Design a protein around this ligand. Structure first.
Ligand SMILES: CCCCCCCCO[C@@H]1O[C@H](CO)[C@@H](O)[C@H](O)[C@H]1O
Ligand SMILES: CCCCCCCCO[C@@H]1O[C@H](CO)[C@@H](O)[C@H](O)[C@H]1O
Ligand code: NA
Length: 254
């Protein structure tokens, strides 16, 4: 068919300070895609602190792609390379995440679709050290109403659950449910998307978030992105838990 290629880098920053540099490569031919990515996560001013890296191979097979029913499958591997700093009883960890994840875009009407993805994960080595449950389910699924070429509405249900399949393990058990809404504006070469997540019910061992993605394509294979988001848990009279996300990214296609 045609080979398509993307390369890119992202820089994400999350404070209340974490620095998250990353780079990726993908190539596709017909229903086949291959994805290398390297992500790292650590405090700003590395006052050094503990950090990790996250190399990733993913493979996607497009089983069906048309207007009434598209359906798809992602298989993924990564390692988490934890580097502990001034934590007692920890030096390093190396935990791997295995992924299988179908993704589907089904047509309800001429301007209403049901789409989503569903990730089942297995998490491998150094679980006690790393604090993770050996199993995880994650999904964002919902409805896209298209107004027109310029305006659309995505409402989705979103679910993360961590559970050990071991009887003799309860480290890192947790559930998150949220409603997520986005209104993606496609203004020619601009892309403007405001969005919220409303926590329904979160527990681990409710919350809300507003944000704004912005995306320019320059018609030569280059594009860039800005994203900002504000999150809050809301607590004892006024003074609540408050977090900022920021993100810049670039991509090149060929
Ligand atoms: C994938 C490549 C991304 C390159 C972005 C580098 C952005 C700058 O990075 C900043 O440099 C500061 C010094 O001013 C450091 O203290 C911080 O760790 C960092 O936020
Ligand atoms: C697409 C890019 C793939 C890059 C794979 C990089 C190999 C990662 O390997 C890791 O290097 C880290 C950094 O010092 C350490 O956490 C570990 O010693 C090592 O496992
Ligand atoms: Na977004």
């Amino acid at each position: 068919n045609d080979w398509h290629f993307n390369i890119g880098a992202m820089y994400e920053i999350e404070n209340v300070g974490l620095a998250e540099p990353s780079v990726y490569f993908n190539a596709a031919n017909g229903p086949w895609r291959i994805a290398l990515a390297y992500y790292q996560e650590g405090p700003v001013d590395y006052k050094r602190g503990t950090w990790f890296d996250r190399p990733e191979l993913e493979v996607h097979y497009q089983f069906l792609e048309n207007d009434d029913f598209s359906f798809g499958l992602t298989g993924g591997f990564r390692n988490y390379g934890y580097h502990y700093v001034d934590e007692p009883g920890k030096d390093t960890a190396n935990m791997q995440r295995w992924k299988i994840a179908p993704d589907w875009d089904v047509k309800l009407t001429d301007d209403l679709r049901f789409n989503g993805w569903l990730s089942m994960y297995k998490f491998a080595n150094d679980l006690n050290t790393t604090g993770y449950a050996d199993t995880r389910v994650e999904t964002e699924t919902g409805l896209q109403y298209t107004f027109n070429e310029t305006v659309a509405l995505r409402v989705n249900y979103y679910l993360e659950r961590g559970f050990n399949m071991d009887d003799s393990r309860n480290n890192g058990e947790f559930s998150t449910q949220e409603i997520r809404a986005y209104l993606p504006l496609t203004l020619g070469n601009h892309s403007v998307t405001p969005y919220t997540r409303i926590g329904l019910d979160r527990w681990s061992n409710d919350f809300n978030r507003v944000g704004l993605f912005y995306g320019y394509d320059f018609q030569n294979g280059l594009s860039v992105s800005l994203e900002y988001a504000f999150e809050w848990q809301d607590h004892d009279e006024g003074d609540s838990d408050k977090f900022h996300y920021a993100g810049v990214g670039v991509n090149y296609s060929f």
